[PDB]
Design a protein around this ligand. Structure first.
Ligand code: CO
Ligand code: CO
Ligand code: CO
Ligand code: CO
Lengths: 183, 183, 183, 183
């Protein structure tokens, strides 16, 4: 028993809508457990550090985030330190809200699994707090900074119908097969 | 002995530079003739209404525009009328400058052979004039409105290192395989 | 009212299934009319000469074919003659079958809206007959040669879960932004 | 300093040519050194396990392979074991030749930086020997099995103008945003 999943690509209106809350009657239930399992499976397959339900075609407020040690480790040390990229365990948020904790802007290239094959530089706040429910209805709060805060912002934007191309420095948009190099 | 040409894709720095002028001594010469012939051939093969030399990898101020009646007629007459699409003959401009004559903005979806496979709505001026040299070196001023004005602006933008993604309504960006249709 | 339609891309398993027949009880009915209208609208929007229901996510044996004079004339007359491209009116086929009338092979580049942005050369039979039902259940037959026969064979292949990449000369596969031109 | 590099995409005829050998006189030389440095830099930026000089536009018999432990550990351990995926240090080979040591075929999905965004299943031999020169002219022979043997075969095919779409199970070709998952 295997099935297919797909990450929706830009043009699909589900990516531009504002996702509906998960109804309380759904908390702790099998449908929501299937959705969270699916999100995490695709995230792990694609090695993407976060993913949201609208990207699997489900217009609900659910997102997952996970940054394993191996992904950080593959980033050259100087880049890792400049991007403040450090590992954190899996968190799934249902009906989350975001508050900015440190509004200083930091710009780095970002991509998106729903705009496959492109990167552009995007300003993001240095630190944010995400608060919401876990799939069982318990309150979860996470204050994060650096690269963790960027991923949180990217996924929360997807629940608002916002993609990185709405916020990018467009002159840095590039196919991934083009890159800057040292001479 | 046929040869290969390619249209450079976003990420290639040639699309973001400011094209150099063509020097007087090159006007009417074989190298400029080869370049104009290649632009026209590509433009006709791809059925694009305009193309610029930076998109063939050549950072020089040369562009070509042509809208055959068949291409207008393939647009549904309602959409054709809304877009004020009318045919025009081939023109090649060398070292052109643009003047805006009617600054009212008109918004429709536009694509770009150097961002293959996407469209987005882009506001453009209603009427403009382009003045420049032909490949032989005679001064031409071409005044146009509606869709022709839009194509002139798109190609002029390429010579200044500007792509439509810099000017779009980003919430309308889409892969070409997603579209709005009538119920 | 407006809605969105999308052409499923390679990877979607709907493109590799064998489409089920339309049941006699659905012939003439409103659900089948909605499907045929949608096919034709996408085909006219994308300027593709044929399209099949699996490509709109509907695993049923329905396809449509149309080559307007305008679209035909966008092809240079030399190339049009070489490919035996001539205009033909809209035909919609339900539960079609194909008979080969002239088994001689003809090889030219073709693309597919469900593998957006690529072409490759594919050998096709020179002449075929498609027979099936129109949406109202009337028996319809069309004997076609040249480019029309190629488009018939490409859409029929979609109903059997076959894409052109299964039959192509793989050394000729190319992004559309690479092309061979005349010196 | 700051310069751009790009991985050529399918359609560029450089990918279908047979790369020329590096001449004796060039071994240990500055031009070869520039090439090998560039190739390794691109390969490391893209995190691709292997890369060949034709893919940077240079039709010469030079390839590079490297699988650091972190990159390897991004693959989940069960898939890593199934694929016999183990880390290995950087090798740059000049004028390599390949000998098959175990002709048993193993099939897994493979991609290619010059066909960005797609995967397909490709059968490869289970064990091979690559013999060639290091950039200094020293003779190096590497006997490899499992996933390393796959990457060596893929890069050696690049030097002969062969891409993985020539050898794939075409019914398994997919955009990377479609995937099979476990329920
Ligand atoms: Co995203
Ligand atoms: Co353009
Ligand atoms: Co098709
Ligand atoms: Co490759």
């Amino acid at each position: 028993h295997m099935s297919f999943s797909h990450v929706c690509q830009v043009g699909d209106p589900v990516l531009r809508g504002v996702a509906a809350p998960v109804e309380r009657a759904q908390l702790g239930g099998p449908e929501l457990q299937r959705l969270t399992q699916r999100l995490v499976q695709v995230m792990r397959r694609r090695r993407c550090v976060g993913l949201s339900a609208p990207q699997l075609g489900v217009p609900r407020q659910v997102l997952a985030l996970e940054l394993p040690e191996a992904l950080c480790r593959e980033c050259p040390p100087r880049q890792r330190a400049l991007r403040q990229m450090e590992p954190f365990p899996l968190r799934v948020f249902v009906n989350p809200s975001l508050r900015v904790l440190d509004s200083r802007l930091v710009t780095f290239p970002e991509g998106c699994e729903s705009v496959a094959g492109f990167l552009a530089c995007v300003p993001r706040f240095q630190a944010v707090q995400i608060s919401g429910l876990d799939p069982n209805g318990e309150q979860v709060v996470w204050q994060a900074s650096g690269w963790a805060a960027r991923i949180i912002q990217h996924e929360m934007d997807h629940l608002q119908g916002c993609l990185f191309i709405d916020k990018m420095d467009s002159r840095t948009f590039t196919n991934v097969y083009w890159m800057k190099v040292n001479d």
